[PDB]
UniProtKB/TrEMBL annotation:
Pfam families: Chorismate_bind (PF00425). The lineage of its organism: Bacteria, Pseudomonadati, Pseudomonadota, Gammaproteobacteria, Enterobacterales. HAMAP family: MenF. The active site is at K190, E240. GO terms for biological process: menaquinone biosynthetic process. Its EC number is 5.4.4.2. Pathway: Quinol/quinone metabolism; 1,4-dihydroxy-2-naphthoate biosynthesis; 1,4-dihydroxy-2-naphthoate from chorismate: step 1/7; Quinol/quinone metabolism; menaquinone biosynthesis. This is Isochorismate synthase MenF. It comes from the Bacteria. The gene is menF. It comes from Yersinia pestis. The keyword Repeat does not apply. SUPFAM superfamilies: ADC synthase. One of its GO terms (molecular function) is magnesium ion binding.
Amino acid sequence: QLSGLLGELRQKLCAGFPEQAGIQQLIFPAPGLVGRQLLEWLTAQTHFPQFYWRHRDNHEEAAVCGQTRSFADMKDADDFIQQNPDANGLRIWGLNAFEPVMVNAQASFLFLPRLEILRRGKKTSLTLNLSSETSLQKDALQAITFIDQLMAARALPVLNARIQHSSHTPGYPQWRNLIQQALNDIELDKVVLARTTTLTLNKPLSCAAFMAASRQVNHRCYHFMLRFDDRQAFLGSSPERLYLRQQLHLETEALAGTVSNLDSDPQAAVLADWLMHDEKNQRENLLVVDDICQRLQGGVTAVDVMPPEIIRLRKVQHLRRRICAQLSRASDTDCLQRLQPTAAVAGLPREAARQFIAKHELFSRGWYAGSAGYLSLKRTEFSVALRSARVDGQQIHLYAGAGIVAGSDAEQEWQEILQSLLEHE
């Protein structure tokens, strides 16, 4: 049981630590079962921030709780990892915003956790970070307090809140006016325009319960959840990787080109076949591949692209091409700066899109369309923060986007553009 492990950890904290500045990791192998109960455990805790992570591959999962250091941008988080080459498995977790957020506004919210429970495959480990500018002994003491204030994991509370009001930002007329502004500008090749749906609920959303419902239905997605405190969070279920880095190995992907999914496997297969052989959709995917390659080229010794494949998601099926590279340097700062924001969330041409969005979108995307995941010296992975939502007491703001092209009608785009999970009052 986790309770046994937490006692062993506590015992070790009670032995000495230097009364001098430092950093240390206490790493305890955990029972595999603990790795299957991570959302249950995280959300019972009253310590913040909290970050939950489940890889789209079902093989990596984490619950991280409390903080020992926080960084407001990737550069500073990266610099801290580099200054600790010694410390294997020093992982920093969190969010890189699309646009800086008041949490000065910060480009990222990245933190070295107090406690990290990480599952990879069948092996789970618990890690407690100690950190101080003066005394690791002082910090060990605070860590004992933190441990004594942990709560027992409990089964997940039922998804209960109900919608009593909905509104849209932008509203339809502004959406329509904005899209006209992009159709006139296209005479720009493509711009992706965001819309928030603000649901007002009869009570505070259980983030736990919402995350659990999204996991049951949104397969093949990275699930992430950052709770800043017991009222504010950002969470989502994105099918898309920004990048994976293993030493100088990098993977990313062009995820672009769509057809509907259908519950019937063979009906779905038939549409995937169509998608696989559709020129228009294939071209859209390849221009994404070209942008990504263009952004990587000065930082790689090699880049290459695999054959296209189909990702079958709950309502849609996508064309995907993995892009593999060898980096010149191992710098997560540089990776992020090159890959984010992606063309998929902004449009083409890259800078023409970013500026249109910057000029005309009236509302900040904040965390939406940025990324979620972790960094470390040898391994880093971020998912693009798509299909995501800001929880704010009894309100939830759901994000979505629409790519706008020469042929696009505002009303059709509105009809196309997580809410599924909640029922009305």
